[PDB]
Amino acid sequence: CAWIPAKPLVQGATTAQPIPGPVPVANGSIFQSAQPI
């Protein structure tokens, strides 16, 4: 009865790969902000 396939409570992926960030613009500044929310 413990061998019956079951759906977990927290479905899906339990990890997220950090997304690489945008390439800085060529404006002469060190501060570069990604697409602001």
Partner: protein, 303 residues
């Protein structure tokens, strides 16, 4: 020299660099290191890097070492190997930084990347500040920033102070000595100039542009009041209207209500306001009340 003193070039800007370091060689005027654990922690880190591993459980009570923050400006078009000045400021319970030496300090940017390496001897004045100093050529640039200078046929001159009249005047001045359509104003603060394609060509063009002289046009009437320092500054375009002013312990020299003569130029304004015999602390309140009433025909800013 007017255009360079009035505007700035697009993309030619200074960044800010920050880092943490240690200052050694102080005459017993460093951190207590019992209330600033980071000083001893970073000293132990430096020793461990250099090849000395001090035991974890031990008491170090230093007196010649201070933990400091170093700040600098990354200049436009900085190339690796050049030197810049840095400012060294103590961070915890240090008495002085008189004759200390800044050890190797990496100056990070906003992106937390090392753009300069700082190390040198601090110069402290000697009523002078003791926990703050400056090192001339104390940091060497290690990273360069890519730029778009030399690409495209447009360059923006950004006015330091926004003014439609001044923007139009710079546009007309560039378009008088450099061709018909060499400049177009985009807003109250930006003048777009057409530059030849290339890198040295734009350098030559901007060298020509920068030293041109423009006739500065009347620029708003404003009275700046600094209450924290107790100072008042009025520019030339400040005027007055005839109205009566009363304030404590001030009287006609004979009642307490003194008539202030309408005034057209700045000399008239100064004479009329000095006729009241008002201390600048009283003069600030007088100016604020007159701005409320409407006698003062200027923009009152409190800085």
């Amino acid at each position: 020299e007017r255009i360079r003193d009035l505007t700035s070039v697009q993309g030619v800007r200074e960044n800010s660099l920050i880092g943490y370091g240690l200052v050694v060689g102080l005459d017993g005027t460093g951190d207590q290191t019992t209330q600033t654990p980071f000083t001893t922690q970073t000293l132990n880190n430096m020793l461990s890097q250099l090849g000395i591993t001090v035991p974890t459980g031990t008491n170090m009570q230093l007196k010649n070492v201070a933990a400091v923050m170093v700040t600098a400006s990354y200049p436009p078009f900085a190339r690796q190997g050049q030197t810049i000045d840095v400012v060294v400021s103590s961070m915890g319970n240090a008495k002085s930084l008189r004759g200390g030496t800044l050890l190797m300090t990496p100056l990070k940017g906003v992106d937390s990347q090392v753009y300069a390496l700082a190390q040198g001897n601090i110069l402290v004045g000697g009523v002078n500040q003791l926990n703050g100093g400056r090192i001339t050529n104390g940091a060497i640039i290690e990273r360069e920033l890519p730029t778009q200078f030399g690409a495209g046929n447009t360059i923006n001159l950004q006015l330091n102070d926004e003014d439609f009249t001044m923007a139009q005047q710079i546009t007309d001045a560039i378009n008088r000595a450099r061709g018909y359509g060499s400049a177009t104003a985009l807003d109250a603060r930006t003048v777009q100039v057409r530059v030849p394609s290339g890198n040295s060509s734009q350098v030559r063009f901007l060298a020509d542009i920068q030293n041109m002289e423009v006739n500065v046009t009347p620029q708003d009437a404003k009275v700046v009041i600094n209450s924290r320092t107790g100072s008042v500054v009025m520019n030339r375009e400040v005027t007055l209207d005839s109205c009566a002013v009363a304030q404590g312990n001030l009287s006609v020299t004979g009642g307490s209500l003194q008539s202030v003569r309408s005034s057209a130029n700045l000399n008239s304004v100064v004479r009329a306001l000095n006729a009241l015999g008002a201390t600048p602390m009283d003069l600030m309140s007088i100016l604020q009340s007159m701005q409320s009433a409407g006698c003062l025909r200027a923009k009152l800013e409190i800085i």
